[model samples]
Target chain A: MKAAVLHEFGQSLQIEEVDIPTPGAGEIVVKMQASGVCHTDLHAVEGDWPVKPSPPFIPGHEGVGLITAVGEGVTHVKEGDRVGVAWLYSACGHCTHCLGGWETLCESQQNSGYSVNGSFAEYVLANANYVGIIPESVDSIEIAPVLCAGVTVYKGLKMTDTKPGDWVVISGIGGLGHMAVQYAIAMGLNVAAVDIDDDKLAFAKKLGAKVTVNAKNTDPAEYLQKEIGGAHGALVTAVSAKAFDQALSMLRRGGTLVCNGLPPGDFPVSIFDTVLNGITIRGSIVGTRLDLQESLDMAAAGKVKATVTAEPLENINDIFERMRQGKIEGRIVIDYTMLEHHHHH
Target chain B: MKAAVLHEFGQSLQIEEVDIPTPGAGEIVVKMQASGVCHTDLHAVEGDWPVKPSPPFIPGHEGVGLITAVGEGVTHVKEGDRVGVAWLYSACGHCTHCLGGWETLCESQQNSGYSVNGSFAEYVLANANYVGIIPESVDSIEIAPVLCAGVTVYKGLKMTDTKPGDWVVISGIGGLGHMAVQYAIAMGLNVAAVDIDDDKLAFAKKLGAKVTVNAKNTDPAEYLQKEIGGAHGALVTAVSAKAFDQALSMLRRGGTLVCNGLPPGDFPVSIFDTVLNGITIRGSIVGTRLDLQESLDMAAAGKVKATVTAEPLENINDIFERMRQGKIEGRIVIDYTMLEHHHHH
Candidate 1:
C-alpha cells in the first residue's frame, strides 16, 4: 500500500510503500477516496503539542471512503459502505465520559492520526461502530471537509446555543470559520465574520455573513458592540489567545463565547465582569458521530459548502508549508483518485 | 426612620435617624419587616470593590416587607401588598438586558444598596414593577434570604444545566452554599458538597448532599475524580479564586462550572485543558424576575428552606464582623419587627 508516512518530528512526510492495515475485531479497513488536511494535522505531524504521536505513522483524520474489508463482530457497517474516519477514532464504549455522550473525552480513546494509524494512506483501519456513515450520493471531495472541519464548527456553534435570528460571531474566517459562517447562516443566525485577511472576510461575506470586520485594522469587539450591540454567541476558531479574548469581550450579557481553537495559552477572564454580566465561556472540541452526520447532511443538502482545492498526496509537504505561511484559504483536500495508480515513490 | 447607614468606607455603619423615604411615580414605599445580611452587604459597607456606592446608603437587598404606600401610576401592588426588594432594585424595562429577562446585568439598572438606598431601614422605596411579590403565607424571616442568596444560587444551579440524577458539586457550604445544596436537591440533582468547615459540610449533608468533601485537607478535584468520576455541574459559591479553579477541575467532560460568588480576583482557566475536555465555565450573578419568582415558589412549596438566625437592626455591625470572620453560617436576617412602636432610634 502507498501512504504518506511520518518518520520524524518537524520533518516532511515521505511517500513510501507500507503494509496495508488489517481490520481487527469490530473494525474495518477504509479504502481512501479523499482526505482533508486540517490545521491539527500540521500540529500532529510537527509534534507541536505535549502529547506527541509516535513517528512512522500516517496523519489524516478527515478521511472518507468505501470500506474494503470488515473484521469479525462488525455488524452495523459492512464492506463497500462509504464512511468517514474522524478524529475520534475509537473510544471505550462504557467509560463514564463515553457513556455520558462525550466520547472524545474518554481516557482510553484512540485518536485518529495521533495514537493510531490514520487515513492518509491507500487503506486505513477504523472502528465499525464509531465511523461516521457518509451518504453515497454526496461528492467525496466536499464531504471530506465536513468529516473534520465542518462537524467541528457545527458542534462549536451548537455549544453557543444561539437562537434563530440571533447574532453569531465567527472569528477567524479561514477553513473552519468559512464553514462556521455557512452553518450559522443555515442555523438561522445572523453572522458577524472577523478575520485578519480581507479576502477571507469577503469570502465569509459572500458565504452569507451579515457583517464583516477586518481584525487587522479594526477592533472586532468594539465594532461588534457598536454595530450589533455584541453577539448573542461568539465562536473563536482563530489560533490566537487574542482572538479568544476578543470573542469573549464581544458577547452581550448572558451571551456565550465558544472556543474551538486550540491556542497555547491561558484564558484570563475577569471574575467580577464575568459574574456581574453573567457571561458563559465554553470550550468546544471536535464533534461526535451524530454531529458529523448532521454536518455531512447539511453539506449534502447544499446548506453548507466547503471551498476546497484538490491536490495529490505527493503535495502534502508543500501544502503544509503553504498552511504554515498562512497562504491557504478555505481547505486543501488530498484526492486519492489523482494517483493514476497506487504507486509508491 | 432608623437605618443602618454607611457613613464612611471601611467603618462600621452607624444606626442613625434618617428621613422616611416617600414613594415616587411607579414606585412604592415598603415598611420593612425583615432583611437578610449577605456577603455583598459586607463588601458594600466596606467599599471593597472598585465600584463603590456613595456613603449614607442603606446596604441590604434581601428586604421583605409590606407596601405601606403606593405612588401614582402603580397598579401592580397597592398599599398592604407584601413584597421583597432584591439585588436588582430597578432597571430601564425597555433596555436589551431588561427586555431579555436579564435585568440584573442592565447597564442603566439601579442596584439595591449599591446604587440606591436599599433595605437596612425602617422604610425603603422600591420600584413597583421590579419588586418581587412575596407570598404573605410564607415566613418573612425564611423568605428574606430567598430574595438574594436563594435566587442567586438557584440561578447558578440552573446555569449548570444538569439533568435529574446527575452529580452537581456545591463548592462552598456557607450561606449561599447551603441554599445551593437545597436547590440542587430540589432540582433533582445529586449534590457533592465541598467545604473547609466540617460543621458546614455536615449541614450540607443534612440538607440532602449525597457526598461531602472536607476541602480543608483533601484536594477536591482529586477526591471528586476518585469518588464520583466528576460532577456534571459545579457551582462555586466560595469567595476564593482557588475554589473557582478547583471547581473547574472537578467538572466532567462537557460539564459546566457556574460561578455565583464574586471573588475579588481574575479567573484563570487553562485553554488547553478547557478546549480538550469540552468544559463550560459560566458566570451567574443573580437571578432574573422569573428566576426569583421560581426560587420563592420552591420555598413557598416547602421544598427549599433557608436556615436563618433572626437578629435586630442594632446588631448589624456585629453581624458584619462575624461574617467577615467566617463565623456566620447559613444566613442572618434582621428582625425589623423587634423595633417597638416603629419609633426612630
Candidate 2:
C-alpha cells in the first residue's frame, strides 16, 4: 500500500510502499478514496505542537473512503460501505462524557493523526463503530474536508448556543473559517467574517457572509461592536492568540466566544472585564459522531460545500509548503482515485 | 439623615448628616432597614476598580428596605412595600441583553454603589422597575446579602448549566461561597468547597458541601480531578486570580468554570488545554431582577439561608476593618432598625 509517512521532524513526508494494515477486533480496513490535508496534519508532520504523533506514522484524518475489509466483532459496519475517518479515532465508550454524547471529551480517547496512524495510506485501519458513514451521494473530494473541518466548526458553532438569526462572527476566513461561515448561514445565523487577507475576505463573502472585515486595515472587534452591537457568538478559527483576544472583544455582554483553533501560548482574559460584562469563553474540539453525521447531512443536502482543489498524494509536501506560507486559498484534497486509474489500466 | 459617606478614596467613611434622597420619574426612595457589607463595597469605597462612582456617594447595594416614596409613573410598588436594591440599579431595558433576560449584561446599565448612589444611607433612591420585591416572609437582615452575593452565585450556578447530581465546586468559602454551597446543594449538585481557611471549610460543610478541601495544604484541582473525576461545574468566588486558574484546572472535560469574583488581574488561560479539554469559562455579574426574585423566593421557602451578624449602623467602620482583615465570617449586616429604636425612645 502506498502511504505518505512522516520519517523525521521538520522534514517533508516521504511517499513509500508500506505493508497494508489488518483490522483488529472492532476495527475495519478502509480503502482511501480521498484525504484532505488539514493544518493539524502539517503540525503533526513537523511535530510542532506539544502533543505529536510518533515518526513512521501516516498523517491524515480527513479521509473519505470505503470499507474494503472488516475485522471480527465489528457489527455496525461491513465491507463495501462508504465512510469517513476523522480526527477522533476512538474513545472509551463507557465514560460519562462518552455516554452523554460528548465522546470528544472522553478522557481515554485516541486521536487519528496525532496519536495513531491515520488515513494518509491507501488502505487505512479504523474503528468500525467510530467511523462516520458518509452519504453515498456526496462527492468524496467535497466531503473530505467536512469530515474534520466542517464537523469541527459545526460543533464549535453549536457550543456557542447561538440561535437562528443571531449574529456570529467567524474570525479567520481560511480553511476552517470558510466552512464555519457556510455552516453558520445554514444554521440561520448572520455571519461577520474577519480576516487579514483581502482574497480570503472575498471568499468568505462568496460563502454567504453578511459582513466581511479586513482585520489588517481596521480593527475587526471595534467594527463588529459598532456595526452589529457585537456578535451574539464568536467562533475564533484563526491560529493566533491575538485573534482569540479580538474575538472576545467582539462579543456583546453575555455573548459566547467559542475557541476552535489551537493557538500557542496563554489567552490573556481580564477577570474584571469578563465578570462585569458577563462574557462566556468556551473551548470546542472536533465533533462527535453525531455532529459528524449532521455536518455530512448538511453537506449532502447542499447547504454546506467546501471549495476544494484535488491533487495527487505526491504533492503532499507542496501542499504543506503552501499551507505554511498561508498561500492555500481553500481546502486541498489528495485524490487517491487517480491510483484507481493505474490499477484499471 | 445620618449616613456613611465616601468623601475620598482610601479614607474612612464619615458618618455625616446628609439630605434624604428624593426619587425621580420611574424611581422610588426606600427607607433603609438593613444593609449588607460586601467586599465590593470596600472596592467601591476606595474607587479601586476600573469603573468607580465619584466620591461623596453612598457605597452599598444590598439594602433591604421599605419604599417610603414613589416618583411619578411608579406603579409596581407603593409606599410601605418592602424591596431590595441590588447591584444592577437600572438598565436601558431595550438592548439585546436587557430584552433577552440578561439585564445585568446591558451595555447602558447603572451599577449601584459603583456608578450611582446606593444603599449606605438612611434613605436610598432606586429604580422602581428594577428593585427586587423582597418576600415579606424573609428577614431583612438575612436577605440583605442575598441581594448581591446570593443572587450573583445563584446566577453563576445557572450559567454553568450543571444538571442534578453533577459535581460543582465552590472555590471560596467566605461571604459568597457559604451561600453558594447552599444554592448548589438546593439545585441538586454535589458541592465541593475549596478554601484556604479550615474554619471556612467547616462552615461550608455545615452549609451542605459534600467535599471540603483546604487548598493551602492540598491542591483542590489535583484532588478533585482524582477523587470525583473533576467537577462538572466550578463557581470561583475567591478574589484571587490563582483561584480562577485553579477552578479551571478542577473542571472535567466539557466542564464549565463560572467566574463570579472580581479578582484584580488577568485570567491566564491556556488555549491548548482549553480547546483540547473542551472547557467553558463564563463570567457572571450580579443577577437581574428575575434572578434576584428567584433568589429571594428560594430564601422565602427556606431553601437558602445566610449566617449573618448584625451590628449597629455606627459600627460600619468596624465591620469594614474586620472585612479587610478577613475576620468577618459569612456576612455582616448594618442594622438600621437600631436607629429606629433610638428615634422611638
Candidate 3:
C-alpha cells in the first residue's frame, strides 16, 4: 500500500510503499476513498504544537472511506460499510466523559493520523466504534471535510446553544468558519460572518450570511452590536487573541462564546462581565460521536456540504506548504479514487 | 409605618416613621416578617461597585413576609398570602431571556434593593408577579435567606451541570456556601466543602459535607486534586483572586467552574487549560423565577435550610458594620417578627 509517511519531523511527507495496516479487535481497515487535508495535519508535519506527533506516521484525519477488512470482535460495523474517520481515532469508551457522550474529551483518546497510520493512503486502520457511518446518499469527495472541519463547527454551534432566529457571529471565514455559516443557516440561525478578507466575507455572504463584517476596515464587534443588537452566540474560529476578545465583546446578555481555535482557546476571559452579563464560555473540541452522526446526517440531508478542492494523494506535501503560507482558500482533499485510473489502465 | 432609608451613600440608615407603601396593578404590599442581610445590601449602603444604587433607597432583597394588600389585576397572590420577595423585583417578562427561562439576565430587570425600594421596611411595595409564594409549613425567619443567598447558590449549582454522585467543591462556607453544601447534599452530589477557617470547615462537615478543606494552611487545589482526583464541578463563592485560581485548578477533565463571587467574577481565565481540559466557565446570576420556585420548593421539602442568626430590624446598621468587619457568621436575618411580638403584646 502506498501511504504518505513522515520519516522525520519538519520534513515533507514521502509517498512511499509501506506495509498494509492491520486492525486490532474492535477495529476495522478502511480502504480510503478520499481524505481532506487540514491545518492540524500540517501542524503534525512540523510538530508545531507542544503535544507533537513523533516521526514515522501518516497525517490525515478527515477520511471518507469504505470498510474492506473487519477485525475480530467488531459488531457495530462490517466490511463494505461506508465510513468517515474522525480526529478522535479512538477513546476509552468506558471513561466518565465517554459514558457522558463527550468521547472527544476522553484522556485515552488517539488521533487517526498523528497517533497511528492515517488515511493519506489507500487504507486506514481505525476503531470501528469511533468512525461515523456515512449514508449512501452523500459523496465521499464532498463529505471528506465533514469528518473534521464540518463536525467541529457543527459541534461548536451546538455548544453555543443558539436557537432558530437567534443571531450568531462566526469569526474567520475559512475551512471551519465556512461550514459554520452553512450549519447556522441550516439550523435556522441568523449568521453574522466576520473576517479580514473581503473575498472570504463575500464567500460567507454567498452561503446565506445575514450580515458580513470585514474587520480590516471596521471592528466586527461594533458592527455586529450596532446593526443587529449583538449576537446571541459567538463561535470564534480565528486563532488570533483579538478575535476572541471581539467575539466575546459582540455578545449581548446571556450570550455564549464557543472557542475552537487552539491559540484563542488560551486567551483571557473577563469574569466580572461574564457574571454580570450571565455569559458562558465553552471550549469545544472537534465533536463527539453523536455530534459526528448529526453532522454527517445534516450533510446527507443536503443541508450541509463542504467547499473542497480535491488533490491527488501525491500532492499532500505541496498542500501542507500552501497551508503553511496561508494560501489555501478552502479545504483540500486527497482523492484516493484518482489511483483507480492507474489500476484501470 | 417605620422604614430604614439611606439618606446618603456610606451613611447609616435612618429609621423613621414613613408613609406606608401603596400597591399598583399586578403589585402587592408585603408586611415584612423577616429580611436576610446580604453583602449586596452592604454594597448598596456604601454605593460600591460600578453599578451603584442611589440614595433614598431601602437596602434589602431577601424579604419573607405576608401579602397585606393586593392591587387590581393582581391574581398570583392576594391579601394574607405568605410570600418572599427576591432580588429580581421585576423583569420585562416577554424578552428572549425571560421566554427562555433566564429572567435574571433580562436587561430591563429591576432589583429589589438597588433598583427599587426593598424589604428593609414594615411594608414593601413590590411586583406581585415577581415574588415567590411560601408554603404554609416553613417559618418566615428560616426561609428569609432562601430568597437570595440560598437561591443564588442553588442556581449556581444548577449551572455547574453536575449530576447525582458527581463530586463538587464549594469554596467559602459562609452565607451562600452553607446553603450550597446543603443543596448539593439534597441534590445527591458529594460535597467537598472548602474554606479558610477550621470552624467553618467543621461546621460544613457537620452539615454532611463529604470532605472539608481549610485553605489557611493548605492549598485547596492540591488537596482536592490529590485526595479525590479533583472535583467534577467547582462552585467558587470565595472572592479572592487566588481562590478563583484554586477553584479553577481543582477540576478534572470536562469539569465546570461556576463563578458566584463578584470579585472573583472579574478574574482572568487561562483559555489554554480551559480548552485543553474542556472546562466550562459559567457566570450564574441569582436564579430565574423558575429557579426561585425550585429553591422554595426544596426548602419546603425539608431538603434545604439556612443557618441564620435572627436580629431585630433596627439592628441593620450594626449588622452592616459586623458584615464590613467580617465579624458575622452564617447569615444575619432582620427579624420583623420581633415587632410582631410587640404588636401582639
Candidate 4:
C-alpha cells in the first residue's frame, strides 16, 4: 500500500510504499474511499499538538472508507460495509469517560491516526464499535468533512443549545468555522463570524453568517457588542487563547462560550468574571456516534454544506503547503483513488 | 420608615429615620419582614462591584416582605401578598438575556442595592414582575437566604444536572457553597466540599458530602483525582480564580464546572486547554421565581437545608465585621422583630 507519510515535522508528504493494515481481533479493516485533510492533521504535521506519534505516521483522522475485512467478535460492521472513522477511536468501554460516551478523552483509548495506523493509506484497521456508519446514499467525499470538522462544531453548537435569534459567534471561520455558520443559521441562531482574512469572511457570509468581522481590523468584542448586543453563545474554532478571551467578553450575562479550538497555553480564568455576569465557559470534544449521525443527516438535508479543495492522494505536498499558509477556505479532502492501482512508487 | 443607610463607602451602616418608599406605576411597595445579609451585600458596601449607586442607599437585596401597596397597572402581586425582592430588580423582559431567563444582564435592568432602592428598610419599592412569591408556610426569616444564596446555587446545580454517584465538587462551604452541597447531595451525586476550615468541611459532611478536602493544606485537584477519579461536575462557590482553575482541572471529560462565586479579579482562561479535554465551564446567575419555588420545594421536602446565623437588626455592624473577615459560615438573616418597637439606640 502507498501512504502519505510525514518523515519530518513541518515537511510535506513522501508518498512511499507501506504494508497494508489488516483487521486484528475485534477490529475492522477499512479500505479507503476518501478522507478529509483536517486542520488537526495540519496541526499534527506541524507538531503543534503534543504526543507526536512515531515519525512516518498517517495524517488524516477523518476518513470515509469501505470495510474489506472483519476481525473476530466484531459485530458492529462486516465486510463491504461503508463507514467513517471518528477521532474518539475505541475506548475501554468500562472507563468512566467511555461509559458515558465521552470516549474522545479516554485515557487508554486508541486514537485513530494518532496512536494507531489511520486512513491516509489504501486500507486501515478501525475499531468496529467506534466506526461511524455513514448513509450509503450520501457522497463519501462530501461526508468526509462531517467526520471531523463538521461534527466537532456541530457538537459544540449542540452543547450551547442557544435559541432562535440568540446571538452565536463563531471565531476563526476557517474549515470548522464555515460549517458552524451554516449549522447556526439552520438552528435559527443569529450567526456572527470572525476571521483575519477578508476572503474567509466573504466565504463565511456565503455560508450564512449574518455578521462578519475581521478580527484584526476591528475588536471582536466591541463589534459583536454593537451589532448583536453581545453574543449569547460563542463557539471558538480557532484555538488561540486571545480569541477565547475576546469571545468571553463578547458574551452577555449567563451567556455560554464553547471552546472548540485547542489552545496551547493555560491561563487563569476569573471566577468573578464568570460569576458576576453568570457566564458559562464549556469545552467540547469531537462528536459522539449519535452526534455524528445527526451532523450527516443535517448535511444530507442541505442544512449544512462543506466547501473543499479535492485532490488526489499524490498531491499531499501541495495540500500541505496550502494548509500551512492557511489558504484553504474550507476543508481539503484527499481522494484515495490514487492508491487503487497498487503502484508503490 | 427606618433603614440601614450606607452614607458613604467604607463606612458604617446608619440605622436612621428615612422616608417610606412609595410604589410607582408598574411597581409595588413592600413592607419588609426580614432580609438576608449576603456576601454580595458586603461587596456592595465595600464598593467592590462595578456599579456604584448614590450614597445613603438602602443595603439589603435579599429580603422577604409583604406587599403593603400595589401601584396602578401592577398585576403580579396584590396588597397583603408575600413577596421576595431579588437583586435583578427590573429587566426589560424583552431583551435577548431576559428572554433567556438571564434578566440580570439586561442593559436596562436595575440591580437592587446597586442601582435601585433595596430592601433594607421598612418599606421598599420592587418591580412587580420581578418579585418572587414566598410561600406562606415557610417562615420569612428562614427563607430569606433562599432569595439569593438558595436560588443562585440551585440554578448552578441545575445547569450541570450531575447524575447519581458522579463526583460534584463545591469550592466553598459558606452561604452559597453550603446550599450547593445540599443540592448536589439531593440530586444523588457524591459531593466533594473544598474549604480551608475544618468546621465548614465537617458542616459540609453533615450536609451529606461524600468527601471534604481541606484546600488550605491539600490541592483539591490532586485529592479529587485520587479520591473519586476526578470530579464529573463542580459548583464553585469560592470566588478565587485559582479555585476556578483547580475545579476545571478536576473535571473529567464532558464534565461541567459551574461558577456561583464572584471573587474580585479577572479570569484568564485558556481556550485550548478547555476544548482538547472536552470540559465544560458554565455560570449561573440567581434563579428565577420558578427556581426559587423549586428550591423552596426541596426545602419543604426536607432535602435542602441552610446553616443560618440569626441576628438582631441592631447587630448588622458586628455581623458585617465578621463577614468582612470571612469568619462567618452559612447565611446571616436579620430579625425584624427587634426593629418593630422603634426603640432608640
Best by TM-score: 2
Best candidate (score: lDDT): 1
Tens digit per residue, CA lDDT, model 2, B187-267? 999999999989889888988987989989998889999999899999988857778778889988888888887778785
**How close to the true structure is residue A32 of candidate 3, measured as C-alpha lDDT?**
89
Query: Model 1 over residues A1-345: C-alpha lDDT tens digits?
Result: 889999998999999999887888988999999998988999999999988999978999989899999999988888789999899998999987788677878889888988898988989989898889987678888889998889999999999989899999999888899999999999999999988888888888899997999888999889999999999999999857688778878888888888887888776766677777788888887988788888988988889989999999999999999999988978999999885456777
Cα lDDT for residue A24, model 4? Answer: 80
Error of 2 at B24 (Å): 4.2
Candidates sorted by TM-score, best first:
2, 1, 3, 4
CAPRI category for model 1: medium
Query: What is candidate 2's CA lDDT for residue B270?
Result: 70
Of the pair 2 and 4, which is ahead by DockQ? 2
TM-score computed on alpha carbons, candidate 2? 0.95
Residue-pair clashes per prediction, in order, are: 0, 0, 6, 9
Q: What is the lDDT of residue B252 in candidate 1?
A: 80
Which residues of candidate 4, in runs, are more than 4 Å off? Answer: A6-14, A45-50, A73-78, A95-99, A137-140, A267-271, A301-303, A312-318, A338-345, B73-82, B96-102, B339-345
Candidate 2 residues A12-48, lDDT tens each? Answer: 8899999888988999999999999988898898898
TM-score of chain A of each: 0.95, 0.95, 0.95, 0.91
Better of 2 and 3 by DockQ: 2
Candidate 4 lDDT over A71-102, as tens digits, reads 98988678888999877677888976677766
Better of 3 and 4 by lDDT: 3
Q: Which stretches of candidate 2 lie over 4 Å from their true place?
A: A73-76, A339-345, B339-345
